[PDB]
């Protein structure tokens, strides 16, 4: 078959891959990005479509504008299971037309010299002399099977991890997802019969009964249009997510016009610390494929962008040292762990605690303001549940006279602090990965057993 040579091959053009392509562009490298979807569909994986302004500001990424921005967001209303307590957390964000925004990023990368092939699937890794060296591609548009050699593959295939999963199982880069370390999530976008009240606020409903291990949401995309959905924890033996959706839609969105459903669909959402390494010989993994999603709230588009930025920085470094080994690309890990990954680890711990609380516990915690709105935001945005905050909460939790997981909150805050420090001491070279990964697994297993 035809053979071509590129500096970098990016597989997948979602928020992650498009960010890597945009960040890598005009820097002296010959870059190809492929995606299985046609151009007009790239970026259309089911999603709530809500992204913090802070993630854009973190990277100085351009804001969505015009048709890309469906609705400006000014905060979130968090509802207790019993619906009796509502927290308002202020904070700026965007309700996107994700395909339009994603497609703009790709088009700008393309304008800056990135080559893009839509309707093109990476089918088989080229793995030779112990390195990823490219991919066999199938271009549906030309009916051509092609070999593309690359010094670095950026694996951005989303939740399918379709390319890295084909590599030798020996490689750290083939790390799999445990069923309990992901949610399945499902959403619909519908027009509403009435104008949406406070249409600039997202609504999140916590209820361990109607969305076990996740939550329900109501994300307005305009005055009369809403993205409504839920996520539930995987690996727990729960019934189909669409059963919960059908049963409880009316509770959360009594105002939707079912005759005006616009889109619907679901997908897997990783909810854990990132891949232990996001780099190996000839390859970096980003976005959902590298488990970059916030484990507490399930937001992954901002972290996908961050991972793409770190991949760009790492790759430029590798070309400046002629070194495409894991060691040569290792800055990917250092960059990502400092920007988001250490936070994700702390939040992976926090999520495990939250998923085991009862509705009674959550009703109590929210009613009693055991932590403040701002503290919960700090946990989300920084991965930090300060020990002083945990101490204050424990003083309130001390007044409860029934058994409750809430009594472990200080212990949870301590483990969150420990794992965060462990991640910020990420190994400086691959020869220390094993030792460190064992320390992390030990922290996690200890923590898991401390919750019973
Ligand atoms: C229902 C639901 C709701 C939400 C969310 C998820 C889900 C399922 N999330 C998560 C967020 O949607 C997700 O984390 C990011 O879109 C992931 O971006 P990626 O680029 O990693 O994957 P994404 O899946 O977007 O892109 C991967 C691309 O790779 C392509 N591909 C795969 N294999 C290939 C191959 N072998 N060859 C070529 N192409 C290949 C696919 O066609 C696809 O375009 C979220 N996050 C958030 O920030 N805000 C929110 O409101 C929500 N809500
Ligand atoms: C502002 C970003 C928040 C939107 C995230 C929506 C993600 C939906 C999936 C929820 C499942 C994760 C809960 C643990």
């Amino acid at each position: 078959m035809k053979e071509l040579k590129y500096d970098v091959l990016i597989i997948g053009g979602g928020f992650a891959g498009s960010s890597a392509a945009y960040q890598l562009s005009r820097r002296g490298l010959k870059i190809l990005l492929v995606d299985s979807k046609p151009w007009n569909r790239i970026g259309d994986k089911p999603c709530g479509d809500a992204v913090s302004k802070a993630h854009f500001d973190k990277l100085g990424m351009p804001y969505p504008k015009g048709e890309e921005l469906e609705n400006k967001i000014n905060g979130i209303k968090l509802y207790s299971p019993d619906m009796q307590t509502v927290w308002t957390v202020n904070g700026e964000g965007f309700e996107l037309n994700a395909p339009l925004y994603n497609q703009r990023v790709l088009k700008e990368a393309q304008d800056r010299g990135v080559e893009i092939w839509d309707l093109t699937t990476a089918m088989k890794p080229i793995f030779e002399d112990g390195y990823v060296k490219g991919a066999v591609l199938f271009n549906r548009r030309t009916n051509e099977e092609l070999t593309v050699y690359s010094k670095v593959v950026v694996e951005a295939t989303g939740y399918s991890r379709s390319f890295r999963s084909k590599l030798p199982p020996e490689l750290p880069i083939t790390e799999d997802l445990d069923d309990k370390d992901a949610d399945v999530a499902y959403r619909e976008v519908l027009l509403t019969k009435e104008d949406i009240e406070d249409h600039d606020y997202l609504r999140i409903f916590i209820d361990q009964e109607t969305s076990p291990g996740g939550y329900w949401w109501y994300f307005p995309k305009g005055k009369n249009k809403v993205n409504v959905g839920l996520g539930i924890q995987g690996g727990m033996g729960y019934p189909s997510i669409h059963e919960y959706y059908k049963k409880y839609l009316d509770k959360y969105a009594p105002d939707v016009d079912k005759s005006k459903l616009l889109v619907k669909g679901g997908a897997l959402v990783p909810t854990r610390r990132p891949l232990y390494t996001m780099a190996w010989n000839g390859i970096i993994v980003i976005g959902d494929s590298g488990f970059t999603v916030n484990p507490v709230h399930g937001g992954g588009k901002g972290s996908a962008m961050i991972s793409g930025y770190c991949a760009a920085k790492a790759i430029l470094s590798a070309f400046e040292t002629g070194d495409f080994s894991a060691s040569g690309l290792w800055d990917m890990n250092i960059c990502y762990v400092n920007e988001y990954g250490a936070k994700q680890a702390s939040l992976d711990i926090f999520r495990r605690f939250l998923q085991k609380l009862s509705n009674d516990d959550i009703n109590y915690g929210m009613k009693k303001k055991i932590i403040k709105e701002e503290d919960l935001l700090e946990a989300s945005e920084k991965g930090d549940l300060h020990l002083s905050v945990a101490d204050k909460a424990m003083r309130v939790i001390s007044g409860l006279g029934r058994p409750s997981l809430l009594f472990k909150l200080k212990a949870v805050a301590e483990s969150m602090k420990k794992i965060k420090e462990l991640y910020l001491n990420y190994p400086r070279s691959p020869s220390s990965l094993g030792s460190w990964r064992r320390e992390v697994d030990n922290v996690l297993t200890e923590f898991n057993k401390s919750l019973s």
Side-chain angles (χ1 to χ4, degrees), residues 72 162 182 245 252 261 322 425 431:
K72 177 66 192 296
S162 63
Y245 185 85
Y252 301 113
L261 184 141
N425 285 139
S431 58

PDB file of all heavy atoms in Angstrom, residues 72 162 182 245 252 261 322 425 431:
ATOM      1  N   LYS A  72     -25.006  31.732  27.345  1.00  0.00           N
ATOM      2  CA  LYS A  72     -23.997  32.078  28.349  1.00  0.00           C
ATOM      3  C   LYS A  72     -24.449  31.582  29.724  1.00  0.00           C
ATOM      4  O   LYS A  72     -25.623  31.717  30.081  1.00  0.00           O
ATOM      5  CB  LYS A  72     -23.694  33.590  28.372  1.00  0.00           C
ATOM      6  CG  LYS A  72     -22.684  34.030  29.465  1.00  0.00           C
ATOM      7  CD  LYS A  72     -21.271  33.478  29.242  1.00  0.00           C
ATOM      8  CE  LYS A  72     -20.379  33.675  30.466  1.00  0.00           C
ATOM      9  NZ  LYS A  72     -20.154  35.134  30.743  1.00  0.00           N
ATOM     10  N   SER A 162      -9.758   3.246  20.853  1.00  0.00           N
ATOM     11  CA  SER A 162      -9.781   2.265  19.781  1.00  0.00           C
ATOM     12  C   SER A 162      -8.418   1.903  19.201  1.00  0.00           C
ATOM     13  O   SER A 162      -8.245   0.815  18.669  1.00  0.00           O
ATOM     14  CB  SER A 162     -10.727   2.731  18.665  1.00  0.00           C
ATOM     15  OG  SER A 162     -10.248   3.924  18.099  1.00  0.00           O
ATOM     16  N   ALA A 182     -16.006   4.345  35.716  1.00  0.00           N
ATOM     17  CA  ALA A 182     -16.679   5.112  34.675  1.00  0.00           C
ATOM     18  C   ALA A 182     -18.165   5.207  34.958  1.00  0.00           C
ATOM     19  O   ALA A 182     -18.712   4.393  35.717  1.00  0.00           O
ATOM     20  CB  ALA A 182     -16.435   4.474  33.310  1.00  0.00           C
ATOM     21  N   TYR A 245     -33.929   7.248  32.864  1.00  0.00           N
ATOM     22  CA  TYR A 245     -34.294   8.430  32.100  1.00  0.00           C
ATOM     23  C   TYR A 245     -35.804   8.487  31.940  1.00  0.00           C
ATOM     24  O   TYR A 245     -36.429   9.473  32.331  1.00  0.00           O
ATOM     25  CB  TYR A 245     -33.614   8.483  30.733  1.00  0.00           C
ATOM     26  CG  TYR A 245     -33.899   9.783  30.002  1.00  0.00           C
ATOM     27  CD1 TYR A 245     -33.125  10.916  30.232  1.00  0.00           C
ATOM     28  CD2 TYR A 245     -34.946   9.876  29.082  1.00  0.00           C
ATOM     29  CE1 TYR A 245     -33.400  12.122  29.576  1.00  0.00           C
ATOM     30  CE2 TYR A 245     -35.218  11.067  28.417  1.00  0.00           C
ATOM     31  CZ  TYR A 245     -34.431  12.180  28.667  1.00  0.00           C
ATOM     32  OH  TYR A 245     -34.695  13.353  28.018  1.00  0.00           O
ATOM     33  N   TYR A 252     -37.524  16.079  36.741  1.00  0.00           N
ATOM     34  CA  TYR A 252     -36.453  17.044  36.518  1.00  0.00           C
ATOM     35  C   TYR A 252     -36.713  18.028  35.386  1.00  0.00           C
ATOM     36  O   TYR A 252     -36.145  19.129  35.365  1.00  0.00           O
ATOM     37  CB  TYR A 252     -35.138  16.295  36.290  1.00  0.00           C
ATOM     38  CG  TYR A 252     -34.815  15.442  37.494  1.00  0.00           C
ATOM     39  CD1 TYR A 252     -34.821  14.055  37.418  1.00  0.00           C
ATOM     40  CD2 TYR A 252     -34.558  16.037  38.728  1.00  0.00           C
ATOM     41  CE1 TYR A 252     -34.560  13.278  38.551  1.00  0.00           C
ATOM     42  CE2 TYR A 252     -34.295  15.277  39.855  1.00  0.00           C
ATOM     43  CZ  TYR A 252     -34.302  13.903  39.756  1.00  0.00           C
ATOM     44  OH  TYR A 252     -34.030  13.152  40.864  1.00  0.00           O
ATOM     45  N   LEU A 261     -38.123  16.867  20.305  1.00  0.00           N
ATOM     46  CA  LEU A 261     -36.796  16.304  20.595  1.00  0.00           C
ATOM     47  C   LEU A 261     -35.887  16.608  19.405  1.00  0.00           C
ATOM     48  O   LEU A 261     -36.243  16.349  18.257  1.00  0.00           O
ATOM     49  CB  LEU A 261     -36.879  14.796  20.842  1.00  0.00           C
ATOM     50  CG  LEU A 261     -35.516  14.201  21.239  1.00  0.00           C
ATOM     51  CD1 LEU A 261     -35.666  13.159  22.312  1.00  0.00           C
ATOM     52  CD2 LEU A 261     -34.775  13.644  20.018  1.00  0.00           C
ATOM     53  N   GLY A 322      15.410  15.233  19.575  1.00  0.00           N
ATOM     54  CA  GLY A 322      15.421  14.034  18.694  1.00  0.00           C
ATOM     55  C   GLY A 322      15.070  12.726  19.410  1.00  0.00           C
ATOM     56  O   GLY A 322      15.566  11.643  19.042  1.00  0.00           O
ATOM     57  N   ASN A 425       4.493  14.728  43.070  1.00  0.00           N
ATOM     58  CA  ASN A 425       5.814  14.112  43.051  1.00  0.00           C
ATOM     59  C   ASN A 425       5.908  13.035  41.967  1.00  0.00           C
ATOM     60  O   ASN A 425       6.547  12.006  42.152  1.00  0.00           O
ATOM     61  CB  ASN A 425       6.166  13.534  44.435  1.00  0.00           C
ATOM     62  CG  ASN A 425       6.544  14.612  45.442  1.00  0.00           C
ATOM     63  OD1 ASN A 425       6.151  14.540  46.618  1.00  0.00           O
ATOM     64  ND2 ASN A 425       7.293  15.625  44.993  1.00  0.00           N
ATOM     65  N   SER A 431      11.746   5.005  34.519  1.00  0.00           N
ATOM     66  CA  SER A 431      12.266   3.907  35.342  1.00  0.00           C
ATOM     67  C   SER A 431      11.694   3.908  36.765  1.00  0.00           C
ATOM     68  O   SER A 431      11.876   2.938  37.505  1.00  0.00           O
ATOM     69  CB  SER A 431      13.795   3.912  35.396  1.00  0.00           C
ATOM     70  OG  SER A 431      14.272   5.145  35.897  1.00  0.00           O
TER      71      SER A 431
END
